[PDB]
Design a protein around this ligand. Structure first.
Ligand SMILES: [Mg+2]
Ligand SMILES: [Mg+2]
Ligand SMILES: [Mg+2]
Ligand SMILES: [Mg+2]
Ligand SMILES: [Mg+2]
Ligand SMILES: [Mg+2]
Ligand SMILES: [Mg+2]
Ligand SMILES: [Mg+2]
Ligand SMILES: [Mg+2]
Ligand SMILES: [Mg+2]
Ligand SMILES: [Mg+2]
Ligand SMILES: [Mg+2]
Ligand SMILES: [Mg+2]
Ligand SMILES: [Mg+2]
Ligand SMILES: [Mg+2]
Ligand SMILES: [Mg+2]
Ligand SMILES: [Mg+2]
Ligand SMILES: [Mg+2]
Ligand SMILES: [Mg+2]
Ligand SMILES: [Mg+2]
Ligand SMILES: [Mg+2]
Ligand SMILES: [Mg+2]
Ligand SMILES: [Mg+2]
Ligand SMILES: [Mg+2]
Ligand SMILES: [Mg+2]
Ligand SMILES: [Mg+2]
Ligand SMILES: [Mg+2]
Ligand SMILES: [Mg+2]
Ligand SMILES: [Mg+2]
Ligand SMILES: [Zn+2]
Lengths: 145, 82, 150, 155, 129
RNA sequence: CAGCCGCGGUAAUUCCAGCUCCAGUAGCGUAUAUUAAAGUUGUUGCAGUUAAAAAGCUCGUAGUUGAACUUUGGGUCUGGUUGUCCGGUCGGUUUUUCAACCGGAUCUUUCCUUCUGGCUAACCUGUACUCCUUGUGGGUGCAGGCGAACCAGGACUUUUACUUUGAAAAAAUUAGAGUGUUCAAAGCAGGCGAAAGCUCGAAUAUAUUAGCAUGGAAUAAUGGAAUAGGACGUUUGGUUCUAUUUUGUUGGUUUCUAGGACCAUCGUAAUGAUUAAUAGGGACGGUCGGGGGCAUCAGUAUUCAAUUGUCAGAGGUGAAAUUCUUGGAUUUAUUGAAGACUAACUACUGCGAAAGCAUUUGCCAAGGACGUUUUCAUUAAUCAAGAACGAAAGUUAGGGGAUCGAAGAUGAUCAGAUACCGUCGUAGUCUUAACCAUAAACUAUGCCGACUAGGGAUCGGGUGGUGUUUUUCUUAUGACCCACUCGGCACCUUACGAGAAAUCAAAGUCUUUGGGUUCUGGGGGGAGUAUGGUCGCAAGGCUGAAACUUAAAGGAAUUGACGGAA
RNA sequence: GUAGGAUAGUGGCCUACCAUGGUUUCAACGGGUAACGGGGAAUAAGGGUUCGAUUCCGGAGAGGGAGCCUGAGAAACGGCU
């Protein structure tokens, strides 16, 4: 068996073409090419996005572990799209409140779900210009209302 | 046939057995059978695999009928070898 | 291993070791050439002539005894046909197949065979063109094929 | 391709600043000026002997050969006084470490010195821009015949 | 078709070695092949070898010593620019110390070391370690 | 909390605090990209029998590739370059006893491009023969003349690719030499005197794509003399020239002549075709075949009908029933019509590119295998464009319709059951004219090539057997037996070769990775969908997403458990 | 292509007259680029892969598109219309 690919000394262009063709099966590559992040993906293919807290929503978790996961329905400012952001640590949701500006981040999985929280893709990071972790700690205090 | 065949000189028997192609050197085993007909006293150098209704030099006697391989020498006919 | 079929045989003519003449088998080169020419004139194709030489007379190959082949000799004399022999045969076969098809519209295998033959002919024609025997800008196909044949 | 008529435009054409003196009485009449192009290229006799003018001829005109000297087979002879050379070559690609078979054509001006047919190998010298694409000028048709005389097989 | 005759021969040789044969029969028998064989002999990987004259193409017999391990042939005859030689050797051969990379060049069909000595490289054929 | 695995259900080492403790440390976390890891994009370097993956099949232009063959070998000197032989030496250097290694000149049937001339350096020389140890140690020296010691101009180069060294690829960057920024990251500085002046530096290397330059002639192609219109040249004629140099200088004409070019004829030479690939084509030969088309023959077998006979039921059942006639249905016997099909034969049998193809004979062409001292000489291998076929069903349009028989009626069974089972039975099934172009079109194994381990068979060719029998006396065909031979539809062991393993003599010769090619796949789903194209009468086909979702989906086997399996 | 016109000059740059070419599966043409090009950057066995708005070299632009003055040099925008 010569094994598929042409092993000729002048078979280079063909090989290149083949490689290119193959490239469209690789998912990451495809994404990079087509601008799926730029055309979809609530964020603009960005790390973060500021968004308005439309409402506090407890979401029921996937399976095995059973609980309500204190998420927030956020409306992204730049695009106008509506997403659901999980809110970390104990309480935290109280701190976040309602109708606040909220700086979101990706959850970890380059999109996709994060473990058990179904239909949820984002960590709330900052609420109206602080930081959720900090608030939880009480190392830093909130700037009043 | 195993390990140390010593391949330049086989026994001739082996060569004979193997295909007229699949020995050391290509060499055919077809022969120019020098046929004599019953009629005229003259010798026809008949190749043993004729592929033809082999007439004599002139007279229509019919020497050999071309069977797929070696020719059947029609009727009681006499022949020399090569 | 065969051009068209999936049958990979070696039904084949062996050829002897000595490029030199098989001593005793006598006659003359000139005579042989003359005979060949005569055969050509009569209508026998090169291969046919060779076969004839082999069968009844003491010739083994012309390449051996004369030095030259048969086709070359014919060319020298002025006796090789316009269309080379094999090619001609192929063309004839194609024509026959076409005729058969015409006779019997519904016949798929036959049609396939015809197509194959045509392809073969095309290949051969191309080769000839590349060589320089059959002049260029010339397709040996179907409608004019018959005309070419006869 | 074409040729033959000599003086056959709306205008009428001479080798510029070059004079066919009517007072003087030579056999040639037309004082055929010609150029020796150099670089080890001969002036073809067709150019010096004949009649045609051409500004864009490198032997009977004002075009001067300089820069690169390409060669190549001719694909198209269809347009007037110019040829389409087709310059085949190989392009390396290091990711695979092999080659392509690549194309590039060259439309080049042909002086009626030469007879150029399709599938003729032609050496061509760079020069002034003659036209839109024609920046090259034919100096030597290498395949003069290429089995033209020896076409017929019969003895 | 019978492409790279040399390659085929090499493969056959390898097979023979694997078997534990003391000798090989090779059909086509080229110039290149012959050169390769000679090189091998010089190195010390092969016994006698003899070209039969089938009044035709060729037909070699090689005496195997039991020393050959692999007798490889790289596929398209890649163009080697002297520095790349080292890389090739690294890729193919076990150890910086021993083995050869039989490559044709202007000077002749020679091993890699020989080429280096000459100061002349070219296109690869095969290798022996 | 947890990237993931997961922890949480009153004993949390995973949540929330203290102590301990770890890691990193003036840093450390998080988010998204991206590189590595990913041989999970593979040229190096992956997979496709089953895990995703071989187009159903063959044809086929591009492309990619492609058998072997033309200058090999020996001698004779001559340059180096490090190990050696002592340091011959004031830790370094110069030869010899030796070496391998890399060149160069040559000579070997051998030209390295050839000449028109410049310079002929040199002595192949020998013109006077001797400055002089008894000499072939040594050179003042110029008519014939070795030209390689260089030019300076022709003539015309087979052309590449490949590789060589070189010249060019701005600095910064990168690599990198030197140097005490106190160290470094850096930076191009510095360093030394009488410290009156002097003085090292600011390197080198890379970048390979394309062009330029030169050496090399292996490899790979290309080219040339086969109507030789061929090569040379003391040809001998010629033909077309072109044309400068002297005839005082202009305009001629023709010369001598020296350079083109072009047909003759004379000579010269070894005058000119490599093989004929267990490559390929084609002829020939006997054959082989359930290969194809068209044409007929059988069995028939079922069904309806006809005539024929006989008086209670026969059909059907899965255990069981419904269901049909009796004014003999069935059953018995002869026919007729129709369109079907083509058993037995029938096999680890044969053919065909697959789909597929089994009664007869005939016709019509084609085909493999074989055999061949036949013929051509690279026509060859595989293929994106496009092409040829292509099961069944379906389709339109025609013929028939026996039975089975999606639809539909209908009889039971079960909690129910328009489901089996049951009875019937439009479409079809079958065919003929058009399409369609799909299949578990499956060997779930692309093609071509080569090589590696035993064995018997088995089909088709073909050899040899004083073999046996046929028997019309020797026979000669035929038909076996046996051995070998090539050929396709096929077991056992070890695998050292493989493989995840079932298994595999290929699915082997693969991390000891490269014979030649086409095609396909990249977690599962969403989805063969959406969309657009395109192809169709349609049904559908080819083509073919993403969003979003999810931690498994698979494969193989092992032990179990289980099974209205044995 | 021929001729002109123009230009600092070459040139279908433009005009007249004629010819029918020219490119293309060795992907022309079209579409996209969250593309200014290169030096280079990140990664780093070898081969690679991704990035390069950005200190250097080029190229474009001065809200958009157009036009021009002056001038050796601008189709300038810290000139004009
Ligand atoms: Mg649970
Ligand atoms: Mg074969
Ligand atoms: Mg084929
Ligand atoms: Mg506790
Ligand atoms: Mg990667
Ligand atoms: Mg994989
Ligand atoms: Mg599969
Ligand atoms: Mg399949
Ligand atoms: Mg399919
Ligand atoms: Mg070869
Ligand atoms: Mg550095
Ligand atoms: Mg009925
Ligand atoms: Mg049979
Ligand atoms: Mg039957
Ligand atoms: Mg196709
Ligand atoms: Mg049907
Ligand atoms: Mg039923
Ligand atoms: Mg019911
Ligand atoms: Mg997928
Ligand atoms: Mg002009
Ligand atoms: Mg960029
Ligand atoms: Mg942009
Ligand atoms: Mg930039
Ligand atoms: Mg931008
Ligand atoms: Mg700039
Ligand atoms: Mg602005
Ligand atoms: Mg402006
Ligand atoms: Mg401003
Ligand atoms: Mg400004
Ligand atoms: Zn007679």
């Amino acid at each position: 068996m010569g094994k598929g690919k042409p092993r000729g000394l002048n078979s280079a262009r063909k090989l290149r073409v083949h490689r290119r063709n193959n490239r469209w099966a690789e998912t990451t590559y495809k994404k990079r090419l087509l601008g799926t992040a730029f055309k979809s993906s609530p964020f603009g293919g960005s790390s973060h996005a500021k968004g308005i807290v439309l409402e506090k929503i407890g979401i029921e978790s996937k399976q095995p572990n059973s609980a309500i996961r204190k998420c927030v329905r956020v409306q992204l400012i730049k695009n106008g799209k509506k997403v659901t952001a999980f809110v970390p640590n104990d309480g935290c949701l109280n701190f976040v409140d309602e109708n606040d500006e909220v700086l979101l981040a990706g959850f970890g999985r380059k999109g996709k779900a994060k473990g058990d929280i179904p239909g949820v893709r984002f960590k709330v990071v900052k609420v109206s210009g602080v930081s959720l972790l900090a608030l939880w700690k009480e190392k830093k205090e909130k700037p009043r209302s | 046939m195993v390990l140390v065949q010593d391949l330049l000189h086989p026994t001739a028997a082996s060569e004979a057995r193997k295909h007229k192609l699949k020995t050391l050197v290509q060499s055919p085993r077809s022969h120019f059978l020098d046929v004599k007909c019953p009629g005229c006293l003259n010798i026809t150098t008949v190749f043993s695999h004729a592929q033809t209704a082999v007439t004599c030099e002139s007279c229509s006697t019919v020497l050999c009928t071309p069977t797929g391989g070696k020719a059947k020498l029609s009727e009681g006919t006499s022949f020399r070898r090569k | 291993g065969r051009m068209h079929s999936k049958g990979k045989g070696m039904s084949s003519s062996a050829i002897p070791y000595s490029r030199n003449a098989p001593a005793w088998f006598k006659g003359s080169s000139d005579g042989v050439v003359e005979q060949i020419i005569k055969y050509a004139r009569k209508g026998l194709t090169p291969s046919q002539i060779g076969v004839l030489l082999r069968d009844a007379h003491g010739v083994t190959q012309a390449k051996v005894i004369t030095g030259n082949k048969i086709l070359r000799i014919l060319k020298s004399n002025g006796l090789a046909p316009e269309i080379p022999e094999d090619l001609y045969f192929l063309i004839k076969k194609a024509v026959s197949v076409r005729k058969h098809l015409e006779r019997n519209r519904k016949d798929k295998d036959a049609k396939f065979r015809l197509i194959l033959i045509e392809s073969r002919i095309h290949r051969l024609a191309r080769y000839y063109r590349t060589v320089s025997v059959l002049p260029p800008n010339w397709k040996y196909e179907s409608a004019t094929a018959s005309a070419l044949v006869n | 391709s074409t040729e033959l008529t000599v003086q056959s435009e709306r205008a009428f054409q001479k080798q510029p600043h070059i004079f066919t003196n009517p007072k003087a009485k030579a056999n040639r009449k037309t004082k055929r000026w010609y150029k020796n192009v150099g670089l080890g290229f001969k002036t073809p006799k067709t150019a010096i002997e004949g009649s045609y003018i051409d500004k864009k001829c490198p032997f009977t005109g004002l075009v001067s050969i300089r820069g690169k000297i390409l060669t190549g087979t001719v694909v198209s002879t269809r347009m007037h006084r110019t040829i389409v050379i087709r310059r085949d070559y190989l392009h390396y690609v290091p990711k695979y470490n092999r080659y392509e078979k690549r194309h590039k054509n060259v439309p080049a001006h042909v002086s009626p010195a030469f007879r150029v047919q399709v599938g003729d190998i032609v050496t061509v010298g760079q020069c002034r821009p003659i036209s839109k694409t024609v920046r090259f000028n034919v100096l030597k048709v290498a395949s003069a015949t290429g089995k033209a005389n020896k076409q017929f097989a019969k003895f | 078709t019978r492409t790279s005759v040399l390659a085929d021969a090499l493969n056959a040789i390898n097979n023979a070695e694997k078997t534990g044969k003391r000798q090989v029969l090779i059909r086509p028998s080229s110039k290149v092949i012959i050169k390769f064989l000679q090189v091998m002999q010089k190195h010390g990987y092969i016994g006698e070898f003899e070209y039969i004259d089938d009044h035709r193409s060729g037909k070699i017999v090689v005496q195997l010593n039991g020393r050959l391990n692999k007798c490889g042939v790289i596929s398209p005859r890649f163009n080697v620019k002297i520095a790349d030689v080292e890389k090739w050797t690294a890729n193919l051969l076990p150890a910086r110390q021993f083995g050869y990379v039989i490559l044709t060049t202007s000077a002749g069909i020679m091993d890699h070391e020989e080429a280096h000595r000459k100061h002349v490289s070219g296109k690869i054929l095969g290798f022996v370690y």
